[PDB]
Amino acid sequence: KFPRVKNWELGSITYDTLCAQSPAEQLLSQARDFINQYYSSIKRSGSQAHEERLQEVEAEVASTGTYHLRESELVFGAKQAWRNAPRCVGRIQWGKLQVFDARDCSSAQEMFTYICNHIKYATNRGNLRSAITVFPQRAPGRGDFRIWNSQLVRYAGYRQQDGSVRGDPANVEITELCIQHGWTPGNGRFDVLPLLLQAPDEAPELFVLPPELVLEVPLEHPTLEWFAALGLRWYALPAVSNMLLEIGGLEFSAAPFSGWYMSTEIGTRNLCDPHRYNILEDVAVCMDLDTRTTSSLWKDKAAVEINLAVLHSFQLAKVTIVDHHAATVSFMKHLDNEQKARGGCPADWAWIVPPISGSLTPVFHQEMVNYILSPAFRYQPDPW
Amino acid sequence: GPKFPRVKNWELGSITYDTLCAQSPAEQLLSQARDFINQYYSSIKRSGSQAHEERLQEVEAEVASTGTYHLRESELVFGAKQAWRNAPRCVGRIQWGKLQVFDARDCSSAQEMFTYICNHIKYATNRGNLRSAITVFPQRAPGRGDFRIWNSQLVRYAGYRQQDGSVRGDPANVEITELCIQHGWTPGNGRFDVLPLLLQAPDEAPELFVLPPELVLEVPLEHPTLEWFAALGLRWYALPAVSNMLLEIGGLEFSAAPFSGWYMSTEIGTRNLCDPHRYNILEDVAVCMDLDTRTTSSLWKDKAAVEINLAVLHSFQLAKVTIVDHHAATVSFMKHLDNEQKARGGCPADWAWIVPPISGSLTPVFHQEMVNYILSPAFRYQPDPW
Ligand code: HEM
Ligand code: HEM
Ligand SMILES: CC(=O)C1=Nc2c(nc(N)[nH]c2=O)NC1(C)C
Ligand SMILES: CC(=O)C1=Nc2c(nc(N)[nH]c2=O)NC1(C)C
Ligand SMILES: NC(=[NH2+])NCCC[C@H](N)C(=O)O
Ligand SMILES: NC(=[NH2+])NCCC[C@H](N)C(=O)O
Numbered sequence: 074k075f076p077r078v079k080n081w082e083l084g085s086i087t088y089d090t091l092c093a094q095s096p097a098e099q100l101l102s103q104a105r106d107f108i109n110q111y112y113s114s115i116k117r118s119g120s121q122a123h124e125e126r127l128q129e130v131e132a133e134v135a136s137t138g139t140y141h142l143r144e145s146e147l148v149f150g151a152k153q154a155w156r157n158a159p160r161c162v163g164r165i166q167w168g169k170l171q172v173f174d175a176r177d178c179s180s181a182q183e184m185f186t187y188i189c190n191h192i193k194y195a196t197n198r199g200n201l202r203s204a205i206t207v208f209p210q211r212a213p214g215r216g217d218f219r220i221w222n223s224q225l226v227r228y229a230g231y232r233q234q235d236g237s238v239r240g241d242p243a244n245v246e247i248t249e250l251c252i253q254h255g256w257t258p259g260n261g262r263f264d265v266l267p268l269l270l271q272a273p274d275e276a277p278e279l280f281v282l283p284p285e286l287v288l289e290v291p292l293e294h295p296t297l298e299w300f301a302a303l304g305l306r307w308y309a310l311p312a313v314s315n316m317l318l319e320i321g322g323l324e325f326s327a328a329p330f331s332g333w334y335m336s337t338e339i340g341t342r343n344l345c346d347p348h349r350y351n352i353l354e355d356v357a358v359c360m361d362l363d364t365r366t367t368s369s370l371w372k373d374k375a376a377v378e379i380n381l382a383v384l385h386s387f388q389l390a391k392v393t394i395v396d397h398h399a400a401t402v403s404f405m406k407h408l409d410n411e412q413k414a415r416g417g418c419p420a421d422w423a424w425i426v427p428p429i430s431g432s433l434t435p436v437f438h439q440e441m442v443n444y445i446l447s448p449a450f451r452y453q454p455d456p457w
Numbered sequence: 458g459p460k461f462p463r464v465k466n467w468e469l470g471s472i473t474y475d476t477l478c479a480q481s482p483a484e485q486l487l488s489q490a491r492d493f494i495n496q497y498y499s500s501i502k503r504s505g506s507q508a509h510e511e512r513l514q515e516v517e518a519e520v521a522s523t524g525t526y527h528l529r530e531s532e533l534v535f536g537a538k539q540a541w542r543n544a545p546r547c548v549g550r551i552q553w554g555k556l557q558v559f560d561a562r563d564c565s566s567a568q569e570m571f572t573y574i575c576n577h578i579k580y581a582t583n584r585g586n587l588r589s590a591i592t593v594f595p596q597r598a599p600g601r602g603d604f605r606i607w608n609s610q611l612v613r614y615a616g617y618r619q620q621d622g623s624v625r626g627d628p629a630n631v632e633i634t635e636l637c638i639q640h641g642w643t644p645g646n647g648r649f650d651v652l653p654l655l656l657q658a659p660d661e662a663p664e665l666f667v668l669p670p671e672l673v674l675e676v677p678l679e680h681p682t683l684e685w686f687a688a689l690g691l692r693w694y695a696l697p698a699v700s701n702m703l704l705e706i707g708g709l710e711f712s713a714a715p716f717s718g719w720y721m722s723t724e725i726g727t728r729n730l731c732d733p734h735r736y737n738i739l740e741d742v743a744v745c746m747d748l749d750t751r752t753t754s755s756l757w758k759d760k761a762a763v764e765i766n767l768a769v770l771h772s773f774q775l776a777k778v779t780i781v782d783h784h785a786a787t788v789s790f791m792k793h794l795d796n797e798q799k800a801r802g803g804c805p806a807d808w809a810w811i812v813p814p815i816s817g818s819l820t821p822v823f824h825q826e827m828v829n830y831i832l833s834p835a836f837r838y839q840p841d842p843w
Contacts, residue, residue: 370770
């Protein structure tokens with residue numbers, strides 16, 4: 074059962090041998106395995122340090138049913154989780170990640186402070202830097218530390234009693250939850266949501282982000298003057314905050330991570346999805362395109378200009394962003410580095426190929442094997 | 458549902474369960490035959506009928522005395538349409554019930570293959586008002602050689618390896634171009650030389666047939682607003698007619714059974730014209746559009762690809778040759794998924810192949826999960842005859 078992996082452009086073949094790695098004694102084997110990975114990473118396998126670390130872990134599990142990671146191990150595990158993430162096109166960057174140890178956090182108030190520091194650090198005035206903040210691990214006793222928001226920065230979606238949405242339709246539910254916990258809403262298309270942060274077994278608490286922390290890019294087109302008139306904008310920092318970070322069998326239910334955007338995320342998905350902002354028709358009408366027939370390719374033309382406007386606007390504002398051609402070229406290089414380093418690379422083809430111009434990027438022609446290695450970022454249920 | 462795969466649409470939030478995938482030596486043949494006979498009797502709603510039981514008995518007796526069996530005409534038609542309906546990579550299946558089946562199971566020479574193929578091309582092309590069709594040559598037989606069409610499609614452009622390592626024409630067709638020459642063809646030297654057919658009758662060297670050029674409808678490509686685009690001298694043929702696939706029905710194997718529909722525009726505009734290892738015109742067109750080809754972030758690739766696709770659509774429309782854009786096609790495919798959910802409880806579909814190679818998430822199929830599996834009757838890949 075060993076997968077053959079073909080590139081259809083170049084006719085070349087690799088083999089993925091990494092996928093062969095795809096109660097209390099159960100946590101123990103995950104832990105050992107992770108400790109093994111860590112001491113191999115620093116070239117210290119078999120050392121006294123390695124053997125004694127394995128014993129602390131074993132001793133702690135045998136008597137408490139759990140254990141704790143050292144800071145340097147946490148840092149390693151976080152990088153490895155990103156590296157292992159099948160859906161991430163940005164993994165050429167995996168070794169470059171600021172890890173904020175937030176395991177000494179004991180209240181929603183403190184989560185907020187750590188989160189603000191993350192945003193400040195990550196944003197860096199537009200010169201974006203990848204970062205993760207790791208809050209305290211799950212404990213069999215009690216509730217989880219959770220950030221209820223799906224990203225640290227996201228726009229409200231206000232439902233109308235005629236079923237339409239003002240703002241982002243993806244965030245209707247979190248918006249409602251914010252109002253219910255006492256937030257007085259705005260009424261714009263691009264209102265930044267407050268944070269709902271929950272400490273163990275408490276009601277979540279509401280925290281408004283200080284506006285100067287949230288860097289935003291107004292969208293304009295390099296040649297179409299009317300584009301600025303649409304009043305569109307997007308935030309600088311993509312910071313996923315609902316995913317669970319699993320390292321050595323330990324689970325970090327709150328561990329938000331950020332990098333920078335690939336342009337199609339905003340340009341195509343966020344702005345053109347019919348269940349998101351759905352601006353395709355507006356732009357095409359502005360461009361004076363024939364909307365009445367699919368065969369004018371009015372959708373394709375509008376979409377390209379919208380993506381161009383996103384790149385232009387971010388570059389104008391000096392905010393780090395990567396276009397889908399550049400991002401996929403570098404993913405190809407990453408795939409190649411990982412073949413030499415680990416003998417394969419978990420990748421989810423349907424997520425890696427961009428949502429416009431698929432076959433124009435080299436990843437479209439590249440077969441990919443999807444599998445789950447640990448450390449991992451995993452989905453977890455919403456806390457309500 | 459239970460342990461039927463749950464299938465979600467992310468655009469509308471809706472859920473279906475696929476219940477169809479539950480049906481995914483000589484004894485081998487018999488049970489495939491019986492399963493197919495059962496399917497044929499469902500489709501005419503006579504399961505358990507006396508004629509159903511007689512057909513089953515008739516088939517086991519034929520396999521018993523000969524090691525093989527033969528299809529009634531109407532079974533062949535049902536089986537061909539069903540192979541199309543089951544084809545996971547086909548985005549055009551809304552059309553599956555409208556298929557002209559030419560029965561060519563009496564064919565006995567390569568010369569007769571050519572006559573049948575010419576008839577097929579004439580009928581399917583129909584001066585631009587294209588009609589789906591398949592021509593079925595005789596099935597594999599124990600001890601005797603196969604009927605094969607060596608060409609991958611009935612209509613394909615030559616690809617000539619140059620002195621300097623580059624390719625003139627279509628690089629996808631270098632190997633078949635060279636076989637035609639090995640077998641006696643005098644090669645041209647254009648970018649768009651229609652290949653001759655190499656056709657093989659049982660236990661015989663393939664023979665070479667040149668298609669009369671008036672049977673091969675082509676469309677010159679022009680752009681509705683970019684006047685210079687016509688000057689590129691680009692063109693494409695009207696008729697996509699896959700010829701190298703095996704049609705399997707009830708365990709019988711039709712090694713030569715070419716089928717044709719009409720094009721969806723991205724097949725030509727994006728894959729055939731813009732793939733780096735095909736005609737690779739992306740950069741040439743962007744230069745003519747005066748785009749900045751030195752930087753990825755001008756989106757020159759995306760812009761040129763759109764205009765090439767628009768050129769294809771516009772030009773086919775102008776020539777009054779049937780073609781479908783990737784929006785119309787994917788919309789019709791969603792409607793097919795809905796029909797099939799009701800008819801059969803699911804639809805085998807290969808997401809990677811169904812989502813078009815440009816503007817993916819702009820089409821509804823991007824947001825639709827799909828389950829991939831093999832049902833029979835089927836179109837199958839088969840080894841090249843050489
Ligand atoms: C450095 C810049 C980065 C770029 C350009 C990038 C690019 C992307 C893109 C385009 C996606 C698909 C997301 C979607 O369609 O919603 C993605 C997913 C993901 N990336 Fe990244 N990435 C970056 C950094 C990071 C970092 C720092 C991490 C964490 C350490 C990370 C982990 C992930 C994970 C776990 C997913 C899956 C998210 C999900 O399932 O919703 N990436 N990445
Ligand atoms: C009526 C118009 C039709 C349209 C628009 C259409 C559309 C397509 C498209 C776009 C593909 C992908 C091919 C590629 O990327 O190379 C495809 C594949 C296919 N279609 Fe169709 N189709 C049509 C008719 C037919 C007919 C008549 C049959 C057979 C009776 C058929 C069976 C197939 C099969 C077997 C494949 C897979 C081909 C392969 O593996 O190379 N389709 N279809
Ligand atoms: C909605 C849907 O099907 C998709 N959604 C996404 C996707 N890729 C990325 N990067 N992000 C998606 O949200 N591809 C699939 C096709 C899985
Ligand atoms: C070259 C390659 O990987 C592809 N090739 C094709 C494709 N879809 C279609 N319709 N046709 C392809 O040739 N998608 C995948 C990604 C499988
Ligand atoms: N580039 C990233 N790290 N993205 C994480 C997902 C962000 C999400 N796709 C968005 O458009 O907001
Ligand atoms: N629409 C069809 N029936 N396509 C069959 C495949 C044709 C192949 N994609 C080509 O571009 O020549």
